[PDB]
Amino acid sequence: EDFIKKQIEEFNIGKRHLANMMGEDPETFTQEDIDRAIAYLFPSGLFEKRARPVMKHPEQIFPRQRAIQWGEDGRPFHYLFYTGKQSYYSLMHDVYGMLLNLEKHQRWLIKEELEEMLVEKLSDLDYMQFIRLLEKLLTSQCGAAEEEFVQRFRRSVTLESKKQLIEPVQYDEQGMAFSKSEGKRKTAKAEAIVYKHGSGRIKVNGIDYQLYFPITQDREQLMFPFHFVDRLGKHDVTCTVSGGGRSAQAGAIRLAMAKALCSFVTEDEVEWMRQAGLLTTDPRVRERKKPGQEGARRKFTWKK
Amino acid sequence: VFQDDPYLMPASSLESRSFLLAKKSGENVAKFIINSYPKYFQKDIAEPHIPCLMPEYFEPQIKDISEAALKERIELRKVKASVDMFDQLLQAGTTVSLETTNSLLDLLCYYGDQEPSTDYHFQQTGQSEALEEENDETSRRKAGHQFGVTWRAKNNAERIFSLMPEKNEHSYCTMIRGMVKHRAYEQALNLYTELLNNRLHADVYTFNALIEATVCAINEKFEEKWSKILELLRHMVAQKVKPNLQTFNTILKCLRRFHVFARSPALQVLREMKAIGIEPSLATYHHIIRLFDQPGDPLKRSSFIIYDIMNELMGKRFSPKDPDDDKFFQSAMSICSSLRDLELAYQVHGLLKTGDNWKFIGPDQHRNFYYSKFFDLICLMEQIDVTLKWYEDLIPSAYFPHSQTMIHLLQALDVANRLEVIPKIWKDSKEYGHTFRSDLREEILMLMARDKHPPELQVAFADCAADIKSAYESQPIRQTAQDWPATSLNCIAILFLRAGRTQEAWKMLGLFRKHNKIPRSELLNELMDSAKVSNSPSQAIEVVELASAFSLPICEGLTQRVMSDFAINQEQKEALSNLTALTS
Amino acid sequence: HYVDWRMWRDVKRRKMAYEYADERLRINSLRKNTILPKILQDVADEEIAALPRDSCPVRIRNRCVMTSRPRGVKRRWRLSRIVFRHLADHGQLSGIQRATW
Amino acid sequence: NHHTYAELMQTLRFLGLYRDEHQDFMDEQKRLKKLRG
Amino acid sequence: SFFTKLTADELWKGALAETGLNRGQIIGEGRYGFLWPGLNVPLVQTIAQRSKEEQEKVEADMIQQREEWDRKKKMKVKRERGWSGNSWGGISLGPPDPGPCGETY
Amino acid sequence: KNRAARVRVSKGDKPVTYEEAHAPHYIAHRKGWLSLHTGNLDGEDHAAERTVEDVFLRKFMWGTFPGCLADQLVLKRRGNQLEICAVVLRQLSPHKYYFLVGYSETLLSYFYKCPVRLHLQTVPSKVVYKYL
Amino acid sequence: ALPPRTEKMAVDQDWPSVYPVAAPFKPSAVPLPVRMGYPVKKGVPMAKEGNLELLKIPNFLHLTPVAIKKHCEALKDFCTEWPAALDSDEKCEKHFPIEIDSTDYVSSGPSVRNPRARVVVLRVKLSSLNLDDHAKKKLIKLVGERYCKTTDVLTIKTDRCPLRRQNYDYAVYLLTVLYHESWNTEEWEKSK
Amino acid sequence: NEAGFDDDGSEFHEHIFLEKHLESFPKQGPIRHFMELVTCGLSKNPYLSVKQKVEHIEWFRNYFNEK
Amino acid sequence: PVVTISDEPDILYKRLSVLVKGHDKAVLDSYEYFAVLAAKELGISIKVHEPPRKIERFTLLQSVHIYKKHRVQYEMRTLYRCLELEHLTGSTADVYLEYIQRNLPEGVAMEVTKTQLEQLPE
RNA sequence: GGACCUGGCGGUGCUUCAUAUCCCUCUAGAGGAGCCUGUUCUGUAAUCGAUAAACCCCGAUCAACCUCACCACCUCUUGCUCAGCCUAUAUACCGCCAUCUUCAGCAAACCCUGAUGAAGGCUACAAAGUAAGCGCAAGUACCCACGUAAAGACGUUAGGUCAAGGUGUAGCCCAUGAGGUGGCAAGAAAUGGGCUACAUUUUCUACCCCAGAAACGAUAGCCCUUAUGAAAUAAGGGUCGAAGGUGGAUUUAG
Ligand SMILES: C[NH+](C)c1cc(NC(=O)CNC(C)(C)C)c(O)c2c1C[C@H]1C[C@H]3[C@H]([NH+](C)C)C(O)=C(C(N)=O)C(=O)[C@@]3(O)C(O)=C1C2=O
Ligand SMILES: [Mg+2]
Ligand SMILES: [Mg+2]
Ligand SMILES: [Mg+2]
Ligand SMILES: [Mg+2]
Ligand SMILES: [Mg+2]
Ligand SMILES: [Mg+2]
Ligand SMILES: [Mg+2]
């Protein structure tokens, strides 16, 4: 469209004008630098990242307007026009034909992605039948051409990894070896320093565990990682702690010592204690009272 | 000063002046409302106190008959109230002091027994911009007359000056200055003689007023008035008063009134200036510039003093000293335009660009005249690339081009044969509001249809000519119902033929028949060439018929071309033969 | 020209409290100090209880700068609940969001 | 104070530099009420 | 209080109750009649204010123009009768709407 | 139901602007503020009189540019430089426009006692974000 | 109307010249088709020529990096240099002993009276006093709530007089008369 | 934040040392105790200037005498 | 370029720290860039810091007459950005500080600046 | 009267469910005692409004005077106002909300079906439905994508407010408007919600969880002092040392 063409012209000229006002008057002003330049030029301060200003090629801004499907004869271009779903039915016809001629010889796309590639609205059962035929074609022994068909329809996965990030060993102090990790639970913070050898000693805010933790439940919480990894009296710790309470501080310490001992124990056992549940933060935090209630979830008296 | 919205930009100098005077209207309009109701704006909120933002009180707060009330009414410049209550004090028998009687006669002599004008005076330059090329000698006789108050015999100033007991130098000085300001020159001279008899001293302003009065006196020769001016300066030296810049500038204004015989006295005056040691001003140079530049002088050696002037004046920064320092630049480019000197034009444009000297352009009309003449001269003798560079540098940032310039802007392009720039300057002119200027329209149409051009230039010309025809059609019912010029019709018709807009060309052949305008033989011959291309015998017979209807002496050759070039039927052949028989 | 009579009644209260603040201030301190004799105060008492009952800073009701509503005013903007709601919900009061914590 | 505010609005409306739709209503309604009341 | 005033769009929404009028005015006309230079009278540069006769005559013209305005509201429209007045049975709706297929009825 | 600044849905023929369309829960999530004055931050004194003057400006300029203010104004306030940026339509004559600019330009300066500046922004027709 | 100065404007045209001062957007001046606003379902973010959202943005158009650089060519005129007082805090402590807090609270609108802008507090080191032996005990016992023990700093605060310069005077006067009363030996120092 | 706002060059000894305006009575009296109390209050006043401090003093002086 | 070098030795400003309070972090960090590059070409030593945001949340009623259980809650986001200048000159002060002060943003801008000027005892 | 269309209902059928709701279940309470605070009733010369869910520590994030519109008594007339009115109607309304909603529908414009009736429009191995727009969803706030917030249309209930303010209609302007001064907020009784208890996982003291000792309960009442205020409600001490023995039916919340 002439709209699209002049919008393009205007972006190009305005992009060059954008590098002038900044300082990158050399011709190559990238899209990241464009976002950088408009950020500063006019400060946003709006929570929606679409409600802020923008300067992209009209291509991404304006949507995909489908071309005319018939010339000046009437006479629509695609042969499956009067289905109203030319692209989808042409694809289904093609996939059926490759299944047929293959039988004579012898993750998956989401619905929105398929609709984007076809530029046509689609029913969920239409998507389901397309996926079913495509699975019929991979299950059937197909050739390299129909392999590139299945692979232009299949997309990426982006697998993550769940191995605990091991802290480096800081061979420091005078000549000792330690790891300095962190932990947090219920507004409590604990930075912990664990030396590889030392046969047992904690210095929670300057004093030992029997002084900072008079409660045996707190002492059990401090035992927990060692007694799991069978290294009870074989390392020694020193911990600084702020905020929270008598159990939140102990939990933050427990997490910090586990996340520091990871460097001193093997990778199979750090996986084992992650499975045991000593290497994950506890997201349980206090909720908020609501206007018109008598607590976070607690309500008042009579409502029915 | 103008807003950045494309609807609110002025397109012309007249529109810009209209917008500025409308804004100034809104300003004295808010001043009137706020001073009429000061109670609604007495609450100050800003710290510190901004006395230029608190409202002004114009009503006299002292109602008792007292000299403090006289001082209040003089400070409020209420002439009638001050006169009436001075009469009240005289009736009460209270002796009014010499200083406040002096302030009262100061007010009376400044205002000429009238109240100050309620309009802040920004009128009397309302001349139309269509008469800037004829009769600056009758324009002087009707433009040198501000309708000021003539000094009436037996006014309130004379009554006070007779009534008060002890006459002093300040009172006599103010009386002489007021008489000179209100054109009582002979009375001012007689009062100066009375001052000399009474053994008082006149100050610098009074002596300058006396110089102006002696010159403005009627029926005396320039030699006699010059001798009188020399006598007044001798009296100044004898009274030990030191002359100054405004004294000598008044002398220079007067010798500018004294024309060719006063050229050497101007040089003597400037030499005595530099000898006594007072720096001449831009108004001084404006005065001797406008003296030496007079129409009808066959020598132009009087116009060589402009190069003497600039040779003294490069590189210097100036401060305001005299009222005509803003007229200096306008006068000198009048000289630069008159003598056609690009190097001196550039020289004083440089003197303008030195520091803050741009300020000494002054008002908008002077600015428009200055930049108009500068751009005329740039178009007249500069090379076309630096003319267009000055065009984009000056327009519309510095000034709005006048109607005449448009024509000239073209003549330079026609000389340089850079006719490709015609559509853009046409678009600029239409943006600046020159759409309804018939002389411009005619000029771009001839320069545009003179020659055969490359086809992309031809089709751009077709768009421009289409919009010109659209404007001509879109002028309904103005008293200048300007009939379609035959030249413009012929040119637009040639251009639409050249770009291939043939059907439009046929329609305005119909417009030719409507407006009874004689078409040109070249336009005709192009119409037959188009009819040959289209293979249209009916169109060929149409243009032959129009030529016969206007009885043009080309019609026989056109008919012979129709027979030679088309396969024609017998009834059309008979009609063409009848048309040739009618023309024969 | 005041929104109501009650607003105009406080604008009068405000004014003559502000003008009659010094006299009251002086005698009152003299009241709650322990230096002058028990009887040397009975006199100052008269002056206060006799100083008019429209300047005592006990009758100042921080009402609404826009629409006289006594109860339900937020001091920082001198506005009632629903007027502050109207302006902050139409978006002409800077910084005021909707609390979503 | 409400007086400078509302009385300047009074005077500026009576000078015609201010058009308040509210006073236009009451003006018009009081006219159509004085027609009958 | 000017502060407690409101827009007219809002005053009428309440007056009509249809959810369950300033057009005859020039931009500077005042009761006092201080005819300005940017409004009403064009832009000689002289502030002035009309007299008691020009004001009364102009406002009399305005109130008469209102009266003729309520007349052009309170004319009568003529509806042709179909089978009876207050019926719909012989009422001719116009020609059918032109077809979007470049058509005409 | 919440009825604060929510223009309800008519029949699909109701022109409406970005500002009017967004509801108060989008007040700085999608809309932002129409008046930028500093008083509503943590430590400041005079925010009340800033708002009292704010509603005044909105109604003065509403009654002084009669029926030409397309959407509502942007009363920003940096230094003592109050600014009344506008989006006024293209119907009245420019000399009248410059007049009401000057009249306001000086009258709010003498009411509030500081530099007040109006930077109009003429627009052809009242804009439409969506038809409700 | 008029075809705008945006497409009249070309590249290599000076933007510090185009926008001198801080001013609201003016998209006709702006040669950038910048689009703002949550879009409609099948549409784009709103255009540039009429947005109020593009108006309400502070608009740092006036100050572009190159404008900063050229601005301060002139702004470079007005600065001397510091001496070799050294980045070493002990060196500047040796060279210039005391420290004073004297602040402004800039607001934005009609007035500049923020009374709390008269706060003046003074921090001084006894190891920079150097003339204090048993007279130090005097200073300490005299100032009760000050002299934290970990760092040897005395902090006297004045907010008792309306002006900042006479508050500075009150800090220096109280310092010197505290000093003189500390060096004033008094008759009851021995019966401790 | 203090442009203008001179207060006639108060300069630190008129504001808080009111001994020059104290007008000494016999100092051992409760009245003179009051003057110490009120003097320290006007010293710790930063909102009032020295001129309103001294008219506050003379109010009490006038009235204290009046009795 | 009027300079006017006058008489008395410098006031010796230590640690002129600007605390910038605002409603909008995007204006605050754009301001950070404007001041950081200005101090870079000024020669003056700047450092950055983020003093943590305070939310003033508060509750009002939603209905005009009754229904106290249905309430609205409004909040203020006050964010701070500290821009501390260390080892700067008295002349250096009212030219940089002045440039920034005049080129301050609107309602989302405060410039609380503490100055620690050094001096000799007396 | 006959026959239908649509909707509501059914102590209406089958199936699948609810999960803090439906039951069986789990934890802490209400209902029993005292106190605080609303409301009803009684009372008084003494406001008004809310009044099953969706009123009842509700307009009030708040009444000694003020507030205040109530009452008594006495005064004011172009009255802070080109007046005013807290006069009547929320069954004329704007405004801002409750409720279903702890929902998913509301739908312009077409098209088809019903012999061209009210109306209706389903079958993916598919039989007429296509759909812009609002709503859920999505995107945002807070610590995550989780949870909690916000959000939740059309309409329902002439549901709530002319008393927040504005306001149509009808009324008053010797009045129903304006001001000053002093009182109104008491329980033979009742009920809603909270607070504290009836102790031994308790009580007092240190400590802020390794002791000593006891083997109880008023934030009421009277007295003293203080705070603030012109003028005492609040606060501390003193004194005292109630009823009360973990509360039936029913019910609440998670
Ligand atoms: C007597 N009824 C027919 C009635 C009449 C009017 N108004 C009029 O007819 C008066 N019309 C005049 C003034 C003469 C023009 C009425 O205005 C009313 C009502 C009914 C009430 C009932 C109210 C009741 N409330 C107080 C508990 C109730 O049971 C409900 C409810 N949904 O819970 C109501 O509907 C009720 O609140 C209500 O709305 C009524 C009226 O408004
Ligand atoms: Mg009939
Ligand atoms: Mg709700
Ligand atoms: Mg009711
Ligand atoms: Mg009443
Ligand atoms: Mg909710
Ligand atoms: Mg949602
Ligand atoms: Mg009802």
Side-chain angles (χ1 to χ4, degrees), chain B residues 40-41 45, chain D residues 4-5 8, chain F residues 56 107-113:
Chain B
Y40 300 125
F41 314 102
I45 325 169
Chain D
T4 88
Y5 289 97
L8 171 72
Chain F
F56 185 112
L107 241 193
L108 304 307
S109 274
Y110 281 7
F111 222 138
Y112 166 26
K113 298 315 176 193

Side-chain angles (χ1 to χ4, degrees), chain B residues 230-245:
Chain B
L230 295 179
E231 188 178 357
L232 269 309
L233 77 86
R234 286 173 195 165
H235 287 193
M236 181 91 143
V237 176
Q239 291 181 38
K240 298 92 55 196
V241 201
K242 290 187 179 181
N244 57 2
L245 168 67

Side-chain angles (χ1 to χ4, degrees), chain C residues 85-97:
Chain C
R85 282 206 27 113
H86 199 263
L87 287 182
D89 279 23
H90 297 216
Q92 328 179 295
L93 263 42
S94 351
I96 312 77
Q97 303 258 246

Side-chain angles (χ1 to χ4, degrees), chain G residues 105 113 164-166 169-170, chain H residues 1-3 10-12 46:
Chain G
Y105 315 157
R113 283 318 153 244
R164 193 171 41 102
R165 56 162 277 162
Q166 47 155 339
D169 283 306
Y170 186 55
Chain H
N1 275 117
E2 305 134 44
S10 60
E11 263 305 313
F12 166 71

Side-chain angles (χ1 to χ4, degrees), chain F residues 26-124:
Chain F
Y26 298 137
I27 197 43
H29 292 248
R30 273 158 213 204
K31 262 181 54 166
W33 304 279
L34 305 198
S35 98
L36 263 196
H37 95 88
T38 165
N40 271 268
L41 263 155
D42 213 338
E44 179 277 12
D45 319 333
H46 293 91
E49 328 95 338
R50 298 313 209 281
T51 64
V52 181
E53 188 83 1
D54 228 331
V55 314
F56 185 112
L57 251 303
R58 301 224 171 248
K59 309 158 109 283
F60 179 82
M61 221 56 62
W62 175 248
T64 52
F65 286 68
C68 33
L69 192 54
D71 71 67
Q72 295 181 335
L73 316 121
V74 186
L75 282 159
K76 42 238 299 177
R77 209 181 257 114
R78 73 209 147 180
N80 49 353
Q81 234 181 341
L82 174 66
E83 243 120 348
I84 324 171
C85 173
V87 66
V88 177
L89 280 176
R90 293 218 182 129
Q91 70 288 57
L92 296 179
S93 88
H95 85 62
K96 290 180 174 180
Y97 265 16
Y98 275 116
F99 189 92
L100 279 316
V101 170
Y103 164 57
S104 53
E105 251 302 327
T106 44
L107 241 193
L108 304 307
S109 274
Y110 281 7
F111 222 138
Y112 166 26
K113 298 315 176 193
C114 38
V116 158
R117 310 147 53 99
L118 283 87
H119 316 173
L120 293 203
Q121 188 231 7
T122 44
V123 109

